[PDB]
Amino acid sequence: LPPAPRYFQGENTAGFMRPVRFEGDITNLEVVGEIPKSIEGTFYRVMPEPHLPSFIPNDPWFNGDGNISGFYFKDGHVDLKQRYVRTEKFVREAEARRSLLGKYRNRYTDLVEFKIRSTANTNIVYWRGQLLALKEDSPPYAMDPETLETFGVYDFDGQLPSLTFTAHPKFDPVTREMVCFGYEAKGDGTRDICYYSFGPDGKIAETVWLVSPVCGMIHDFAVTENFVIFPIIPLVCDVERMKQGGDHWQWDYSIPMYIGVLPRRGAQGSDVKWFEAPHGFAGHVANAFEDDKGHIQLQMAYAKDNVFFWWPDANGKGPRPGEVEAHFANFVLDYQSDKLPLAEPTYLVDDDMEFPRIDDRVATRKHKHTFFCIFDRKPGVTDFEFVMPRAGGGAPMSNGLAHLNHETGDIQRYLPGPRKLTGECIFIPRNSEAAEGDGYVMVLLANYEDMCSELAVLDTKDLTNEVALIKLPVRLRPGLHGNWVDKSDVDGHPAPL
């Protein structure tokens, strides 16, 4: 077998990116300032964190084992619980005490045959009394919200129609449905998309099979009252490339960014319209909604080149690190229109941004507040001379949060400091009676001075000021998505406005 390294080597595991790989508890975290005593609930986030050194050199960040963090808040105190998802990968590699899974989404490089290849490392959501740890190439893994015990791969009581479950399901605040899909839904390289939904009682509602024009990556999607929208990233899969040991994904400069629109209820596969946006990268969806005219407003991060530059085109052509900016874009779509090409989007702000969150009480409906990560290259904002040597590589960088009020156009920016970077934030309603976007924001900071992580608590009345700063004595590796589960919400999700 390929030799198993006994320590981590390479840029993707250097400095702040060095795996810690701890599981357990740290109760009564140190706090500077004061956590509002009314806050009660749990912040769950997931990070890729290789449990064992890969036999693949420069294994991408996206291929690390999912490690779940829970920050449990009550009465101004907070405890951390941390535990790896017991994926098939995790368990079998733990038995062997060496890495066995090979390249990202390429089973032909694995040292053993896996049934499920999930690292469960992308998102962690709450559904009907369980956590679901998500990875878009696989079904969810179900976990206990209290102990972070892994129950196992989850198939919704045998109802799951797809081999794949998106990392970005949407929760309708009115109907209390979880709206889902999977791409490559019948296996590697398939153009099959399965759109499906679950009612609050756990019964499957919608199940529609449709066909993608290309086998492209559909990372995120959008849901409105009457439509579901599938933006396709021009990364394309060829299984024959994979069989020769090549990458699952390869950029294609010759295609548009397809945006499929399907009726949300009662549709057939052939009812999908594949609109054609200008070539670019479909980033994370903030939210989508129907306006007065019945037109879809789709607000999402959008770049003009390949953000995932480590998967270039067939001739190795692509941007360099730190080159590509994504911007907060608004696309307009009309399902009635027979004109497939779409106009260039309008931009809501000028900042290089990603990881947009809204007040999920208005998800699928008109929203007027968005919180998002920003990366500002203006000199001084980040002390790059200090940070970059300590930072390692492989992971996106963010040096502030921004709050956009869509009505007024006002923007507040939180800047943690010159030697700190941020992850994706969460929004917490101040209480069940709070106005849209009124409450608290939490964000995990990497502190490159201390080589420690911190959890910042902000009040939306003044996003520039930290109300509290929770000081972890360990590093939490840069992660991906996270969610708030409020104690006052029985089903784990906030009530509609």
Which residue, 9 or 147, is less far from Cl ion as judged by CB?
Answer: 147
Which residue, 318 or 392, is less far from a copy of itself as judged by CB?
Answer: 392
Residue carrying the six token digits 């390294």: 5
| Residue 28 binds which entry of a copy of itself, Cl ion, none, CB below 5-8 Å type-dependent | a copy of itself
| Residue 462 binds which entry of Cl ion, a copy of itself, none, CB below 5-8 Å type-dependent | none
Which residue, 49 or 206, is less far from a copy of itself as judged by CB?
Answer: 49
135 is in an annotated binding site: yes
Instruction: State the residues that interact with a copy of itself by CB under 8 A.
Output: 6-8, 18-28, 30-32, 51-53, 77, 82, 94, 97, 451, 471, 473-475
Residue type, 400: G
Least gap, CB of 76 to a copy of itself (angstroms) = 9
On whether the CB atoms of residues 237 and 108 are closer than 8 A, the answer is no
C-beta neighbour count of 317 within 10 angstroms: 10
C-alpha span between 263 and 270 (Å, rounded): 11
461 is in an annotated binding site: no
Which residue, 24 or 316, is less far from Cl ion as judged by CB?
Answer: 24
Quote the strand ranges of 375-489, DSSP E. 400-405, 411-414, 420-422, 426-429, 439-447, 452-459, 462-471, 482-486
Least gap, CB of 348 to a copy of itself (angstroms) = 39
Question: How many CA atoms within 13 Å lie on the side-chain side of 464?
Answer: 3
Least gap, CB of 84 to a copy of itself (angstroms) = 10
C-alpha span between 15 and 9 (Å, rounded): 11
Least gap, CB of 60 to a copy of itself (angstroms) = 20
Which residue, 53 or 260, is less far from a copy of itself as judged by CB?
Answer: 53
248 is in an annotated binding site: no
Which residue, 30 or 149, is less far from Cl ion as judged by CB?
Answer: 149
Q: What are phi and psi of 240, to 5 degrees?
A: -70, -35
Which residue, 343 or 451, is less far from a copy of itself as judged by CB?
Answer: 451
| Residue 26 binds which entry of Cl ion, a copy of itself, none, CB below 5-8 Å type-dependent | a copy of itself
Least gap, CB of 98 to Cl ion (angstroms) = 21
Instruction: State the residues that interact with Cl ion by CB under 5 A.
Output: 86, 149-150
| Residue 380 binds which entry of a copy of itself, Cl ion, none, CB below 5-8 Å type-dependent | none
284 is in an annotated binding site: yes
Which residue, 30 or 350, is less far from a copy of itself as judged by CB?
Answer: 30
Write out the DSSP string of 244-296: TT--S-EE-TTS-EEEEEEESSS--GGG-EEEEEPS-EEEEEEEEEE-TTS-E
Quick one: which of 83, 75, 85 has its CA closest to 25?
83
168 is in an annotated binding site: yes
Quick one: which of 343, 300, 339, 305 has its CA closest to 322?
305
Buried-exposed string 258-290: b where 16+ CB fall within 10 A, e elsewhere: bbbbbbbeebeeeebbbbebeebbbbbbbbbbb
Quick one: which of 36, 34, 67, 35 has its CA closest to 50?
67
40 is in an annotated binding site: no
| Residue 25 binds which entry of a copy of itself, Cl ion, none, CB below 5-8 Å type-dependent | a copy of itself
Least gap, CB of 24 to Cl ion (angstroms) = 13
| Residue 86 binds which entry of Cl ion, a copy of itself, none, CB below 5-8 Å type-dependent | Cl ion
Least gap, CB of 98 to a copy of itself (angstroms) = 9
Least gap, CB of 313 to Cl ion (angstroms) = 41
219 is in an annotated binding site: yes
Quick one: which of 159, 160, 154 has its CA closest to 181?
160
- Binding positions: 104, 135, 168, 219, 284, 354, 481
